[PDB]
Design a protein around this ligand. Structure first.
Ligand SMILES: [Zn+2]
Length: 226
């Protein structure tokens, strides 16, 4: 059922991407859509949903379209009261508007009990050594892996310069989720080889709206230096 771990050539190398890393940095550096108790208002394609969500911050949008893996996922959350969490983009976002993928969890029943926040531990591995470990927080029992990944990359951009404008001090990176039923999966942290980064295509991995149990999930960040 599990994703086999990275083989050595499954991982994007940053020295083979000659476009602008600030373009990856932007997707994770104090960057996210957040909405709570929202119900979808519209649809573009069969596998997406559109919500009246404004960024209260720098006022860039009052409508978020989220794209899912398929029509069934879309149908399923269409008339549900939901919280949204995800990384938005504007390039080739077509439908005051912004785009994203997945980020969707039902609101009813999905929160801890004394309004507590749950800590999820991230263990960071640099050239196969556990050098730093940190906690990220959510208030959702079933939280998207996108949410947690966003929060862990945000922290790593600050502490570790994970992504910089021109480069990354890292060659390879992957984030790995280990669920308490043994299931593992992982995302490639580095952009595809070449001179142009396509945010929309990068983010599209979050399509499947994967959620995990926040209280028992384990996250590992595996990085290798230049
Ligand atoms: Zn909620």
């Amino acid at each position: 059922e599990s994703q086999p771990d990275p083989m050595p050539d499954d991982l994007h190398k940053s020295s083979e991407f000659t476009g602008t890393m600030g373009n990856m940095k932007y997707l994770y550096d104090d960057h996210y859509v957040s909405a709570t108790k929202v119900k979808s208002v519209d649809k573009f394609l069969a596998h997406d949903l559109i919500y009246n969500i404004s960024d209260k911050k720098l006022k860039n949008y009052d409508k978020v379209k989220t794209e899912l893996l398929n029509e069934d996922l879309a149908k399923k959350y269409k008339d549900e009261v939901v919280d949204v969490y995800g990384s938005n983009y504007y390039v080739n976002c077509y439908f005051g508007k912004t785009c994203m993928y997945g980020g969707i969890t039902k609101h009813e029943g999905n929160h801890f009990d004394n309004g507590n926040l749950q800590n999820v531990l991230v263990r960071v591995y640099e050239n196969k050594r556990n050098t730093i470990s940190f906690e990220v927080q959510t208030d959702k029992k079933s939280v998207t892996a996108q949410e947690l990944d966003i929060k862990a990359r945000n922290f790593l951009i600050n502490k570790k310069n994970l992504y910089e404008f021109n480069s990354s001090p890292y060659e390879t990176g992957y984030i790995k989720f280990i669920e308490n039923n043994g299931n593992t999966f992982w995302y490639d942290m580095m952009p595809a080889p070449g001179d142009k980064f396509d945010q929309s295509k990068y983010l599209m991995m979050y399509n499947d709206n994967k959620t995990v149990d926040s209280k028992s999930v384990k996250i590992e960040v595996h990085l290798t230096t230049k």
